[PDB]
């Protein structure tokens, strides 16, 4: 679920998901078009594709269970949708952590008209 993914992002990165990732670039938090602006935005593009792979799941509201094993995120077994949604969110949180070194505040509230073209998942 969205709130759960937000907490995972905060725990991972130390950034609050809103406002740090909720409107970043072309893909983080809204939008479906254009070339991702940077590696962080690419994480969101891939996460959007990940959710897109699950058209009969509901990642915004469906809560999955996961644990931290030392630092490792381990998705615990729930329904197939929860397992799949968890792996999507785990990957995005890791991706965000891997790219904090290039995260740029200049892409927060990035305007829609600068995001053009379909990029296929």
């Amino acid at each position: 679920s969205l709130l759960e993914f937000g907490k995972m992002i905060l725990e991972e990165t130390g950034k609050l998901a809103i406002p740090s990732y909720s409107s970043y670039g072309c893909y983080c938090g809204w939008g479906g078009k254009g070339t991702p602006k940077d590696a962080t935005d690419r994480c969101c593009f891939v996460h959007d594709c990940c959710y897109g792979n699950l058209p009969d799941c509901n990642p915004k509201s469906d809560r999955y269970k996961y644990k931290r094993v030392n630092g490792a995120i381990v998705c615990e077994k729930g329904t197939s949708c929860e397992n799949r949604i968890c792996e999507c969110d785990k990957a995005a949180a890791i991706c965000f952590r891997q790219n904090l070194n290039t995260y740029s505040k200049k892409y927060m509230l990035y305007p829609d008209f600068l995001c053009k073209g379909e990029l296929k998942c």
Partner: peptide
Amino acid sequence: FLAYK
């Protein structure tokens, strides 16, 4: 904070 994305 830390819902969205």
